[PDB]
Amino acid sequence: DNVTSSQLLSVRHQLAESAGLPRDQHEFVSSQAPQSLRNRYNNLYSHTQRTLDMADMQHRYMTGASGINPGMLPHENVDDMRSAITDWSDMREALQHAMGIHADI
């Protein structure tokens, strides 16, 4: 069977949580980084925002499971979830470096 209801929102909480630069990161990727970096910023997130909506939907008791998409699989959101972090995570180290910092892992 699909993931538990608590997990559905659990995956949307981990995604959206990371799907959002703190502060300094934005000041650079938006006020410094080139358009290519800006347009791509919201792009990867564009898919993350529409994905989380699918997660916190099946919760007929928690969220609004009424007039929603044509019934989607609870595993459809979790999949796209980790996908978004794949782009965001890569940005975490990228943006930090491009901004003007060096890491030593």
CB 12 within 8 A of CB 55: yes
Q: End-to-end alpha-carbon separation of the chain, Å? A: 39
- The experimental method behind these coordinates is NMR
CB 3 within 8 A of CB 74: yes
Q: What CATH superfamily is the domain 1-101? A: AvrPto (1.20.1270.140)
Tokens 């559905």 found at: 8
C-alpha R_g of the chain: 16
CB 3 within 8 A of CB 11: yes
Residues 6 or more apart in contact with residue 57 via CB below 8 angstroms: 63, 64, 65, 68, 69, 72, 77
DSSP string, 28-95: HHTTTS-HHHHHHHHHHHHHHHHHHHHHTTS-TTTS--SS-SS---HHHHHHHHHHHHHHHHHHHHHH
* Domain layout of the chain by residue ranges: 1-101
At 84, the amino acid letter reads A
